[PDB]
């Protein structure tokens, strides 16, 4: 005889039907079917990456996706108004959305509802989200002058919906086994959790991821001008290292203050961030540098160049930047640490309407 398979489809497995002819070229052992997998293992965003385009391409594609959005995009305009879609697509940054906040009828489920009602509790228990939203008052007007499609505020809106609809299309057309790795990162969790077997509402999901947004943004209130004592960065090691500053860096929390971000790898770290703690701690791995490995006497060490240069850029300025030379600076102004004491009230009694229950 002879027979012959080729891979045909899914339904969460994957077809493979095939066929078994005579020798002398007959039909018989018939239809066929299969269903194998593969071990699977999926992951999440970056909360770092988006821009512009955002697999917009996609929208149009696949109804999938496409009611992803619509949903998002539509709730969102509609509890507050503005787009996301809009948003990603374009980036209408600049003098971004002000809202012309009706001051009739769809006033108030905006600027009321959900819009002032918003509260942090970085500090004390009611600091509703920048006042200005009182009673009547007529327009807010978020902005950065740089890219808006950004300011946290709204990338996670984005790079998270993005994600979900993404997903969908996938089961949608089938490919998603049943028993998979959830994969997150910052907000990448929800990159799962909101996916991969449902958790919350397509609607809500964003609605926090949102939240969330604002909210990691006034629990540090500072310079009420533009700007913060506050950012972070990443490094690598430059001469043999791991957990090499676990401790380099836990040896400058006894004096001034920061702990380790996120760890992606060995050589390559998330740096949380105080900002003299940049241009204050950065000489230190950066003289380390100047060639001098890991050997002698421990114990009457360290706190060392620390005290040295550290107490020296503190007050080399009032708000300073960032420099290079291994460990690169990022662009943003916040932690995920030092929160700490801003936990429960927000993300968490928030955390609670829209996620548990079913």
Same mark, same amino acid.
């Given at each position: 005889x002879x027979x012959x398979x080729x891979x045909x489809x899914x339904x969460x497995x994957x077809x493979x039907x095939x066929x078994x002819x005579x020798x002398x070229x007959x039909x018989x052992x018939x239809x066929x079917x299969x269903x194998x997998x593969x071990x699977x293992x999926x992951x999440x965003x970056x909360q770092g990456s988006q821009e512009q385009g955002?697999?917009?391409?996609? &929208?149009?594609?696949?109804?999938?996706?496409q009611d992803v959005w619509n949903r998002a995009d539509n709730h969102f305009k509609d509890t507050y108004g503005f787009s996301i879609l809009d948003i990603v697509i374009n980036n209408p940054v600049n003098l971004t959305i002000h809202f012309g906040g009706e001051k009739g009828k769809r006033i108030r489920e905006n600027y009321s509802a959900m819009i002032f009602e918003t509260i942090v509790d970085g500090k004390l228990k009611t600091e509703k989200i920048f006042k200005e939203i009182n009673e009547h008052s007529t327009s807010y007007? /978020?902005?950065?002058e740089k890219g808006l499609l950004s300011a946290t505020q709204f990338t996670?809106?984005?790079?998270?919906?993005? @994600?979900?609809?993404? /997903? @969908?299309?996938?089961?949608?057309?089938?490919?998603?086994?049943?028993?998979?790795? /959830?994969?997150?990162?910052?907000?990448? @969790?929800?990159?799962?959790?909101?996916?991969?077997a449902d958790v919350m509402s397509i609607e809500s999901l964003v609605e926090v991821v949102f939240y969330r947004g604002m909210t990691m943004q006034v629990a540090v209130p500072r310079d009420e001008l533009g700007r913060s004592n506050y950012g972070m960065i990443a490094i690598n090691p430059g001469r043999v290292a791991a957990s090499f500053s676990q401790e380099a860096l836990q &040896?400058?929390?006894?004096?001034?203050?920061?702990?380790?971000g996120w760890l992606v790898e060995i050589v390559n770290y998330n740096v949380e961030n105080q900002q003299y703690v940049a241009a204050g701690?950065?000489?230190?791995?950066?003289t380390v540098t100047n060639v001098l490995n890991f050997i002698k006497l421990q114990k009457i060490d360290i706190i060392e160049l620390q005290k040295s240069l550290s107490l020296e850029e503190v007050e080399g300025h009032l708000f300073x930047x960032x420099x290079x030379x291994x460990x690169x600076x990022x662009x943003x102004x916040x932690x995920x640490x030092x929160x700490x004491x801003x936990x429960x009230x927000x993300x968490x009694x928030x955390x609670x309407x829209x996620x548990x229950x079913x």
């Open positions: 955002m697999g917009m391409d996609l &929208y149009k594609t696949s109804k999938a996706a007007t /978020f902005r950065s996670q809106p984005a790079l998270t919906l993005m @994600e979900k609809a993404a /997903f @969908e299309d996938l089961k949608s057309k089938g490919l998603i086994p049943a028993d998979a790795t /959830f994969a997150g990162h910052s907000l990448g @969790e929800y990159a799962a959790l909101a996916s991969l &040896y400058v929390v006894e004096r001034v203050g920061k702990r380790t701690d950065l000489r230190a791995l950066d």
